[PDB]
């Protein structure tokens, strides 16, 4: 049922799993000739490119965190904090 932005209660930090999936998903897309939102300063590896897109926070993806009831909180990879 989608928890509104102002009411989101999950972690502001990106989970270790969220990150691995994003980098994986984005590398996959890049490797399938998807448009790249970063300037590949001579980069070639779809993972190394995805990491650049992540670091520059230019990945156009959103995580749908599902709570055990079915409701969910959508989180942009832009707003999510990448520490780790």
């Amino acid at each position: 049922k989608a928890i509104p932005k102002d009411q989101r209660a999950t972690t502001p930090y990106m989970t270790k799993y969220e990150r691995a999936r994003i980098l994986g998903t984005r590398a996959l897309q890049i490797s399938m000739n998807a448009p790249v939102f970063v300037d590949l300063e001579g980069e070639t590896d779809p993972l190394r490119i995805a990491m650049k897109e992540l670091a520059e926070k230019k990945i156009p993806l959103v995580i749908r965190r599902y709570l055990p009831d079915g409701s969910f909180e959508d989180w942009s990879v832009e707003e999510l904090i990448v520490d780790l």
Partner: protein, 551 residues
């Protein structure tokens, strides 16, 4: 992934609805009627018959011929057929449940032995969990041995209200092998309850009554525990091992089905003809035997339906029973492609997270790369190298599905790659791979390493990584698994990488340290007495890769 484009929408399974087949559904979903024990030989002509082992249910001969569907071996799921049973038979799996249901219902009128008029019954009918509720209703109704016409009214105990007549006495049912025997009440009336007799009163159980017992109006009516129309599984379930033309060994199931068929033809013949009635009971019980023995051939009632060899016939139930079973042996665990195994050896010159991979293995294992403008030139070169030089490739998968075999293709020397094509190239240095040491007792028994293609036939690993694996070099063998997606390889590198496993969350301490030679040498190197002169100091400094260049 099950070959060739389907216009149908692809979805995932969200729910599994378990149930039982109505005999009406078995007929509805059938492709062939099935009526001859004979499997093949059109009189003698090697080709499948209009009776068993299909017209129709699927194919053999790696010849498309799968009835109008006409799809051929890999693509075709088989299609079910049916066999109509001359007399109804109990399903082995439900013999006990049938006993218990008979023990809960009046064997004459089909009513529930207890109802809302009984306080203890009301408590049971309230039970939310169907499994616990049926167990309660049974514990109550089993003892009830009369189908009460009237019972004391909710208000007045002196007065009575009519519930649902009949008033008939119930038997005390005992299981005699695959038979259900009753004892009504001089000495008791002993009689075996017929399948038809049971089926009939099961057909007469109210929806409200069978829904009060664990049952479902739509998906599982109690009457369906009694078999009437048997589904014949298609050839993929019972494959005929062909020993090259005019020599084929049919599955045990194929043989069993033929026995069910033969027993059935027999019964149908006597039933139709001058039924001696004490011959009919034999063919009937034999049919029961085969149908039982086909699903389960490990019944308590000893006779173990043997093969003419003295072997005991593989029951369907037997195929599913764990460790080697369908579930445990094929679904929870699988034998897998993109895998390797050799003797592990130790290497002081490999970084903690590297794995030394023998060339032969590197040239066999193949990661499938998508042709992109970034790799177009590199992949083009590996394709040129072919399947025999190390930085090489084995296959080229086109836009147009089918794969080019670089070891045989007349065009292998040519091949002008195109974006989107997949190049199946050899495993190369720095590819993330899953390395494992059985028994895999920990999360650390499986860790991701970076490939390092090297000579000689052993997987070489860093000495420090020995401890998490619980490996030594007295000939231990280790397993390698190659990830195939840019997505699965990110899972390995970002989650299972050896350096990420340094601190174990089992013991809450690190699970890798300095060992053996290095541990011994580190104490020795670091005593006051130990001094080094320039010559060696320089080689020692030069050995540290990260050294700042400052003496």
């Amino acid at each position: 992934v099950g070959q060739q484009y389907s216009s149908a929408p692809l979805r995932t399974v969200k729910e599994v609805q378990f149930g039982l087949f109505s005999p009406e559904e078995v007929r509805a979903i059938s492709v062939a009627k099935i009526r001859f024990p004979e499997t093949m030989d059109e009189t003698q002509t090697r080709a499948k018959i209009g009776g068993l082992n299909d017209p129709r249910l699927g194919s053999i001969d790696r010849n498309l011929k799968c009835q109008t569907c006409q799809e051929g071996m890999n693509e075709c799921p088989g299609h079910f057929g049916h066999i109509d049973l001359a007399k109804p038979v109990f399903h082995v799996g439900f013999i006990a449940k049938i006993k218990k249901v008979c023990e809960c219902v009046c064997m004459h009128c089909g009513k529930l032995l207890l109802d809302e008029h009984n306080e203890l019954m009301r408590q049971a009918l309230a039970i939310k969990d169907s499994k616990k509720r049926f167990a309660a209703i049974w514990t109550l109704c089993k003892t009830k041995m009369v189908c009460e016409t009237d019972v004391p009214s909710e208000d007045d105990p002196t007065q009575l209200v009519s519930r649902g007549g009949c008033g008939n006495t119930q038997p005390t049912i005992r299981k005699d092998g695959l038979k259900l025997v009753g004892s009504w009440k001089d000495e008791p009336e002993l009689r075996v309850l017929s399948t038809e007799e049971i089926l009939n009163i099961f057909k007469h159980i109210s929806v409200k009554d069978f829904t009060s017992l664990g049952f479902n109006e739509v998906f599982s009516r109690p009457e369906w525990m009694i078999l009437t129309c048997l589904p014949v599984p298609p050839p993929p379930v019972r494959p005929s091992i062909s020993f090259n033309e005019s020599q084929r060994g049919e599955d045990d199931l194929t043989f069993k089905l033929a026995d069910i068929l033969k027993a059935n033809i027999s019964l149908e013949t006597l039933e139709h003809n001058g039924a001696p009635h004490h011959a009919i009971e034999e063919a009937e019980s034999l049919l029961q035997f085969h149908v039982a023995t086909y699903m389960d051939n490990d019944i308590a009632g000893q006779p173990q339906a043997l093969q003419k060899s003295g072997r005991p016939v593989k029951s369907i139930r037997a195929r599913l029973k764990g460790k080697e079973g369908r579930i445990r042996g094929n679904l929870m665990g699988k034998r897998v492609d993109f895998s390797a195994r050799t003797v592990i050896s130790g290497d002081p010159n490999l970084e903690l997270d590297q794995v030394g991979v023998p060339k032969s293995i590197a040239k066999t294992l193949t990661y499938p790369e998508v042709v992109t403008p970034y790799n177009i030139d590199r992949l083009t070169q590996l394709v040129r190298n072919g399947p025999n030089e190390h930085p090489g490739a084995k296959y080229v998968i086109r836009d147009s599905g089918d794969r080019i075999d670089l070891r045989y293709s007349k065009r292998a020397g040519d091949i002008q790659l195109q974006y989107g094509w997949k190049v199946e190239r050899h495993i190369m240095d720095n590819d993330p791979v899953l390395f494992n040491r059985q028994p895999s007792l920990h999360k650390m028994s499986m860790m991701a390493h970076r490939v390092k293609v090297i000579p000689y036939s052993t997987f070489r690993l860093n000495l420090s990584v020995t401890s998490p694996y619980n490996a030594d070099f007295d000939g231990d063998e280790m397993n390698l698994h190659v990830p195939q997606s840019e997505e699965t390889r990110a899972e390995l590198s970002q989650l299972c990488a050896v350096p990420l496993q340094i601190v174990s969350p089992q013991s809450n301490k690190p699970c890798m340290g300095i060992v053996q030679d290095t541990l011994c040498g580190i104490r020795k190197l670091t005593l006051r007495d130990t001094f080094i002169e320039l010559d060696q100091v320089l080689n020692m400094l030069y050995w540290v890769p990260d050294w700042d260049g400052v003496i």
